Design an enzyme around this catalytic site. Structure first.
Site, PDB file in Angstrom:
ATOM      1  N   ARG C  14       0.806  -1.200   0.000  1.00  0.00           N
ATOM      2  CA  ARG C  14       0.000   0.000   0.000  1.00  0.00           C
ATOM      3  C   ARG C  14       0.857   1.276   0.000  1.00  0.00           C
ATOM      4  O   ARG C  14       0.385   2.361  -0.367  1.00  0.00           O
ATOM      5  CB  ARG C  14      -0.925  -0.016   1.227  1.00  0.00           C
ATOM      6  CG  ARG C  14      -1.639  -1.355   1.498  1.00  0.00           C
ATOM      7  CD  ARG C  14      -0.988  -2.205   2.635  1.00  0.00           C
ATOM      8  NE  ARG C  14       0.000  -3.155   2.129  1.00  0.00           N
ATOM      9  CZ  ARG C  14       0.412  -4.250   2.769  1.00  0.00           C
ATOM     10  NH1 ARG C  14      -0.069  -4.553   3.970  1.00  0.00           N
ATOM     11  NH2 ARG C  14       1.287  -5.063   2.194  1.00  0.00           N
ATOM     12  N   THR C  77       1.637 -11.352  10.458  1.00  0.00           N
ATOM     13  CA  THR C  77       2.190 -10.809  11.691  1.00  0.00           C
ATOM     14  C   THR C  77       2.420 -11.943  12.679  1.00  0.00           C
ATOM     15  O   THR C  77       3.424 -11.967  13.378  1.00  0.00           O
ATOM     16  CB  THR C  77       1.242  -9.753  12.310  1.00  0.00           C
ATOM     17  OG1 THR C  77      -0.081 -10.287  12.432  1.00  0.00           O
ATOM     18  CG2 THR C  77       1.192  -8.494  11.417  1.00  0.00           C
ATOM     19  N   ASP C 101       5.439   0.153  11.955  1.00  0.00           N
ATOM     20  CA  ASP C 101       4.729   1.205  11.233  1.00  0.00           C
ATOM     21  C   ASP C 101       3.745   2.012  12.069  1.00  0.00           C
ATOM     22  O   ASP C 101       2.816   2.599  11.533  1.00  0.00           O
ATOM     23  CB  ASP C 101       4.033   0.601   9.992  1.00  0.00           C
ATOM     24  CG  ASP C 101       2.858  -0.286  10.341  1.00  0.00           C
ATOM     25  OD1 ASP C 101       2.622  -0.539  11.542  1.00  0.00           O
ATOM     26  OD2 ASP C 101       2.149  -0.726   9.399  1.00  0.00           O
ATOM     27  N   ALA C 378      29.737  43.975  -3.609  1.00  0.00           N
ATOM     28  CA  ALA C 378      28.750  43.226  -4.366  1.00  0.00           C
ATOM     29  C   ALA C 378      29.344  42.714  -5.668  1.00  0.00           C
ATOM     30  O   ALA C 378      30.070  43.445  -6.356  1.00  0.00           O
ATOM     31  CB  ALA C 378      27.541  44.138  -4.684  1.00  0.00           C
ATOM     32  N   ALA C 421      37.454  47.721  -7.616  1.00  0.00           N
ATOM     33  CA  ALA C 421      36.216  47.168  -8.145  1.00  0.00           C
ATOM     34  C   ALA C 421      36.402  46.871  -9.632  1.00  0.00           C
ATOM     35  O   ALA C 421      37.069  47.622 -10.358  1.00  0.00           O
ATOM     36  CB  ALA C 421      35.061  48.181  -7.957  1.00  0.00           C
TER      37      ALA C 421
END
Ligand SMILES: CC(=O)SCCNC(=O)CCNC(=O)[C@H](O)C(C)(C)COP(=O)(O)OP(=O)(O)OC[C@H]1O[C@@H](n2cnc3c(N)ncnc32)[C@H](O)[C@@H]1OP(=O)(O)O
Ligand SMILES: CC(=O)SCCNC(=O)CCNC(=O)[C@H](O)C(C)(C)COP(=O)(O)OP(=O)(O)OC[C@H]1O[C@@H](n2cnc3c(N)ncnc32)[C@H](O)[C@@H]1OP(=O)(O)O
Ligand SMILES: CC(=O)SCCNC(=O)CCNC(=O)[C@H](O)C(C)(C)COP(=O)(O)OP(=O)(O)OC[C@H]1O[C@@H](n2cnc3c(N)ncnc32)[C@H](O)[C@@H]1OP(=O)(O)O
Ligand SMILES: CC(=O)N[C@H]1[C@@H](OP(=O)(O)OP(=O)(O)OC[C@H]2O[C@@H](n3ccc(=O)[nH]c3=O)[C@H](O)[C@@H]2O)O[C@H](CO)[C@@H](O)[C@@H]1O
Ligand SMILES: CC(=O)N[C@H]1[C@@H](OP(=O)(O)OP(=O)(O)OC[C@H]2O[C@@H](n3ccc(=O)[nH]c3=O)[C@H](O)[C@@H]2O)O[C@H](CO)[C@@H](O)[C@@H]1O
Ligand SMILES: CC(=O)N[C@H]1[C@@H](OP(=O)(O)OP(=O)(O)OC[C@H]2O[C@@H](n3ccc(=O)[nH]c3=O)[C@H](O)[C@@H]2O)O[C@H](CO)[C@@H](O)[C@@H]1O
Ligand SMILES: [Ca+2]
Ligand SMILES: [Ca+2]
Ligand SMILES: [Ca+2]
Ligand SMILES: [Ca+2]
Ligand SMILES: [Ca+2]
Ligand SMILES: [Ca+2]
Ligand SMILES: [Ca+2]
Ligand SMILES: [Ca+2]
Ligand SMILES: [Ca+2]
Ligand SMILES: [Ca+2]
Lengths: 458, 458, 458
Positions: C14, C77, C101, C378, C421
């Site tokens: 499932r 089980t 689970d 920057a 720069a």
């Protein structure tokens, strides 16, 4: 006459905070301020707020719209009300007593509470509600005739009283004269060794004076916030209230349970807000504007027909028709003119941007005055700082700033000029000129075969 | 024969919108289209949609899969059905009547409604539900024998009728012949001065004809959307429905209550979706792909085994094994080949990117045809626009585009070539060559001690 | 002696997954690990985990804190418990049997279950809960005297038994000796043709042995996860549990229902977390730190007083007072020193950043050792890769790296130096020097009037 006493001196130990509990914010303002706003609805002739724990801080917020009284030691809600005796004892009227940690009670509910107190001619009216989880709240004890006998605190309650679902919201209206007289009869004989304001109910019951209970129409409003779990619940209810109001006014929300809009934000009709949008402070959103998931706006005004796509905007003005984002950052003191476009990874700060200008990508515009119809190529950096001072750059109309250029302030780019892509600009560029500051390309034939990235070398 | 009448001509005043109410979207398509899809399940021989308010716009969406009739004046739901008389009066069969503002009713529920109408041989069957908050909904009035007497509107209801929890969903099945005959007997004598379709129930009761009620198995489906608060509820229920379907098909959701996936998005099994992911339009997600918080995909196809980390992807194709993000923007008409990596702050637009190419940072690739195994250094900008036209750049296989380079289209970078970091490229670079277009570094000894940033100068 | 059997060999069809069901994660660790942690609370002398379907993978997670037994074929089980016979058959004690689970069952509930089993002297005690939607769960069948008769599976249940609201959580305590004896009497005569562990209850009922049921105080804990819809519910409950714990400890959440914090994340008091924040793995957040919407932190330590604004931080250390964001990416092996500022669109990777250094924008710092008080303009890009190898760059204290510079490793920028720069740096820059590597600006008067962007040319 109507009087109001706001209790805000408690330690809030359960909050585990150095910030006084009543100052914790809910939708942008302190719980105390939400309470102040509700108290305002009954238009009291006198408002007295009791401070104690870090009174210094509390008196900051709204230090004129009310009187303040200090409670040196936090000996209980009852004792806190006692601190107002120098101001209110002796006066005639109806006195509202409210906690500073119940921010969801509305002014409308308070007006209903006062009205009920008056019409039923009670000496005391308790604002009550019902809840499946009353833990920590005083329980309203009644007799077979549904008559109010008293209020019992969680700590002092017996196993049997704890099953009572009707709780005391901590808000009441009392005949002012009788209130302070009854107060004289309370003592610290309880599980908390404190002077409980809730004990005056039992006192009025002894004298046979009329005690009533007015129940909230909306039980969500009853929340008393003593810890951060309750604070988050307060945020959830207030958020739902604010967003509900906006939806009623014509704003669509993809998910109002997950949109965070502060209490005083103004939003025009037809605005569309995706989930996970944050609007804070003195923000205003114009008609038909679209705000997409992730947008975060603080103290800014956004016009009509704008589209803010996952971007952060702070202390700025955004005109009509502007498009920003995704992933843009408009920092303080910026103004974006009509129809401006700011694209991805762009940062604008302390700059005015004229109408129809576009900066679509990877750009920083700081301390600039920029004209209309300007185009910023991707990677453009306006350099404004030298490690000590900031310098300004002026850019005219219709300027074309080439991709990956570096503009070193202070300089002016004249109208219609063009800065070649990849250029470093250190001097003014005259109107109608072009400026180029970059190395010329040289090709070295077959040189790549000698480098690490070449396929033949790995 | 089965017929269907869809009511979509109302003004929607409560929506406070210039857009006709039925055109407001829920999970990507108009409420009207969700209704059309449900109506489709009963396979009607004729479908008639009644338009009025801004009929122009409404007729746009699906202007062939149904007949249209105009209601010049919106005089009521009953009057709207009257507008279909020229097409349906006189025919024999079962006629479904449904509102265009109840987008959550499913085709399966409609098929159940029709089946029940037929098996019970009713002249009229009302689709009903129960709700604790029936405000605004017509109430189903029954007698002691649970027999349907009539439907009473909120405005026309007495204080007593308002307490009825069983509501009219606005969907019904009527014997077609009797429907229009009963319609002749309705008038505007009510609180709204309108022709109520709901009045035909009382009419059938007078004639003794069989009236039944089929109740929805899921009451959430009953939502009638008259304002934006209800629209947001419609978004919430539809979002839960869509996401539930994907989980049943093998897709994991960290938070399905906060994941926004449009109605026609296809998602393969084993896909993992964090919260706050947005998938819109004609999007398809391949098996095992991971979508992290903030991802926003519109009309794109993403392959299998891809990892989209907080990025926005529009009208693009992304092959298997691709990694994008965080904070990347793949704009229209881009194709990312197998195993391509697009890192942070990268924008790709109108470009084809060959297998295994990497552009990890702060890069703009626009209007480029890029080969396989190409590497884009951080800060690379492909320049494609001159203020009037767009130009294309072709990049071969195994090209190494140096960091912070500026590539000015139209140019071609030949296979295995290398562009030196910091270079501006204005000319083709031959296969196996290297190209360098930058200034040479010059050092000025001790010069820094003279500048503002130096520690000795502050 | 206490023993524990954990069932984790099922196929999980499932789940529609190639990953064994018990290995699906909830808040950062497998459901199986949550179960292991709860089992740990009863301090069993022996723990046996039954593996089968892809046992290889399951044995990976915690391959020493328990014994393993293989179930070659998943026959039920009951049959899975049989696989533990070689280890437990013959021993005396109380044996807990739990599914891998049901990750929400707490160690405290298990300790309560064991205590109840012992005090009531049961041969078998079933952990039960009540739910309005019991579909898929075994139902607890009792008689008029509320005595447990048996457990009936959904597939085997009659229409009548399906209405039972009391469900079997899949957890039990059994007298070890009797357990395996009863097991000998079970067979595959049922709707699933499997050996049901649930059939031992009916067996004990036949022998008259004492069977009891201990009910969970919190029914949310009973969730059995068989598909992804249940997995998402498991995520929701666990998320609420974790966040509740943090709020109780003094952490404020704007929206704890929409904040995703893994099970072992440590968060100091006074931290403020906006909605939609993700904290994963071994993450630690220091006091008073603010985490804003969108922040995503994985396996990192963040100090006190930091402000992480919508940024992604991975396998890194962030000191006190650091500010990061918005839209920053701190990649693996980065350390940000005290008071460092990383602004928007910055990427730091494999680098150490000294105290008070700032990199406010559009920058990439990779494989760098960076001193204190450094400023990155920057657009600065540290170039560290040549297509084959990575190179390191060392930056001293108080260095000023000009905007849009390109630093090609390996090089050293000496203390107090300044890089102009727009410069490309290929060589070391001495302490106190300045280095400039860029073309000089040349202006061409009136040249712009000849280009496409000029207003007179359109
Ligand atoms: C990524 C996006 O957002 S896209 C949109 C952004 N778009 C852009 O950035 C595009 C910008 N375009 C450019 O930078 C182009 O290279 C342009 C516009 C400068 C090219 O202009 P052109 O006129 O075609 O170049 P051309 O080679 O003819 O040079 C013009 C003059 O400058 C000189 N020149 C050219 N390159 C250089 C240089 N590196 N240094 C100094 N002078 C130079 C020439 O000698 C010539 O001078 P002359 O006329 O006196 O002889
Ligand atoms: C941040 C990241 O994403 S990392 C990954 C991105 N990686 C990169 O960008 C790395 C790119 N690497 C570079 O740009 C390097 O500087 C390289 C590859 C160009 C250096 O190559 P080298 O061969 O070592 O340089 P070298 O100094 O020997 O120069 C080679 C030739 O070019 C010439 N040259 C060097 N610099 C220049 C210049 N500025 N202008 C013109 N010619 C130049 C030399 O004169 C020499 O010519 P010659 O052989 O005819 O004498
Ligand atoms: C966007 C933000 O984050 S903002 C913060 C980032 N801030 C920055 O990036 C600002 C960086 N500033 C700069 O790059 C400036 O242009 C500076 C600091 C280099 C200017 O310094 P100045 O001293 O004023 O420049 P100046 O023109 O006098 O040149 C100094 C020396 O370099 C030489 N020089 C100037 N430009 C160049 C060049 N392109 N190539 C080679 N040498 C050059 C000069 O000839 C002079 O040499 P000399 O003294 O031997 O004659
Ligand atoms: C004894 C009492 O009143 N109990 C009520 C109080 O309990 P509760 O235990 O919640 O009361 P708190 O300790 O939070 O105090 C109430 C308010 O009074 C203030 N304060 C408290 C002590 C002090 O010495 N000084 C002071 O100013 C606090 O700042 C707070 O705003 O509120 C609940 C609802 O919220 C009610 O259900 C309880 O019946
Ligand atoms: C009188 C009537 O029918 N009442 C029902 C209608 O009320 P309700 O007040 O909700 O009805 P609306 O005004 O929204 O109209 C119903 C639908 O009919 C259309 N329309 C309306 C008026 C018109 O002149 N032309 C037209 O085409 C609208 O576009 C809308 O799609 O729906 C509810 C459920 O949703 C029901 O519980 C109400 O019993
Ligand atoms: C027959 C049985 O036990 N039914 C119970 C089981 O049903 P349910 O149908 O939910 O049981 P599952 O198939 O999920 O199996 C239970 C657990 O046993 C393991 N497993 C299963 C089959 C196998 O051959 N080997 C194996 O190791 C699985 O890995 C899982 O961890 O759990 C429910 C609660 O969660 C209970 O309400 C049901 O009464
Ligand atoms: Ca207290
Ligand atoms: Ca309180
Ligand atoms: Ca001008
Ligand atoms: Ca209407
Ligand atoms: Ca309606
Ligand atoms: Ca090629
Ligand atoms: Ca650059
Ligand atoms: Ca099974
Ligand atoms: Ca199960
Ligand atoms: Ca140093």
């Amino acid at each position: 006459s109507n009087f109001a006493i706001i209790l805000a001196a408690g330690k809030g130990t359960r909050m585990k905070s150095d910030l006084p509990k009543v100052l914790h914010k809910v939708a942008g303002i302190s719980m105390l301020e939400h309470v102040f706003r509700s108290v305002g609805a009954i238009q009291p002739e006198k408002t007295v707020t009791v401070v104690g724990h870090k009174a210094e801080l509390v008196e900051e917020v709204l230090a004129g719209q009310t009187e303040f009284v200090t409670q040196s030691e936090q000996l209980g809600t009852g004792h806190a009300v006692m601190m107002t005796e120098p101001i209110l004892e002796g006066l005639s009227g109806h006195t509202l007593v409210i906690a500073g940690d119940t921010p969801l009670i509305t002014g409308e509910s308070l007006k209903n509470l006062i009205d009920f107190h008056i019409n039923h001619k009670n000496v005391a009216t308790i604002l009550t509600a019902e809840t499946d989880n009353p833990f920590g709240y005083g329980r309203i004890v009644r007799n077979d005739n549904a008559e109010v006998l008293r209020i019992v605190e969680q700590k002092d309650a017996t196993d049997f009283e704890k099953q009572i679902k009707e709780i005391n919201t901590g808000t009441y209206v009392f005949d002012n004269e009788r209130l302070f007289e009854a107060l004289k009869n309370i003592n610290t004989n309880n599980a908390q060794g404190e002077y409980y304001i809730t004990d005056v109910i039992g006192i009025f019951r002894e004298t046979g004076e009329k005690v009533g209970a007015y129940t909230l129409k909306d039980f969500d409003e009853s929340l008393g916030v003593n810890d951060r779990v309750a604070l988050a619940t307060a945020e959830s209810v207030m958020r739902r209230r604010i967003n509900h109001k906006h939806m009623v006014n014509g704003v669509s929300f993809v998910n109002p349970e997950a949109t965070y809009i502060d209490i005083d934000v103004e939003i025009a009709p037809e605005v569309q807000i995706e989930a996970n949008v944050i609007l804070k402070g003195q923000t205003k959103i114009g008609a038909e504007t679209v705000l997409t998931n992730g947008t975060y706006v603080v103290d800014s005004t956004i016009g009509a027909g704008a589209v803010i796509t996952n971007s952060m905007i702070e202390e700025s003005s955004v005109a009509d028709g502007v498009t920003v984002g995704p992933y843009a950052h408009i920092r303080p003191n910026s103004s974006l003119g009509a129809q401006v476009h700011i694209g991805n990874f762009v940062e604008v700060k302390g700059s005015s941007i004229g109408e129809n200008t576009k900066a679509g990508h990877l750009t920083y515009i700081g301390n600039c005055e920029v004209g209309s119809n300007v185009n910023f190529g991707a990677g453009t950096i306006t350099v404004n700082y030298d490690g000590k001072n900031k310098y300004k750059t002026v850019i005219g109309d219709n300027v074309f700033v080439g991709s990956n250029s570096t503009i070193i302030a202070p300089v002016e780019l004249g109208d219609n000029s063009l800065v070649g892509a990849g250029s470093t600009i250190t001097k003014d560029v005259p109107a109608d000129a072009i400026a180029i500051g970059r190395g010329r390309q040289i090709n070295k034939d077959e040189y790549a075969t000698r480098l690490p990235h070449h396929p033949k070398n790995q």
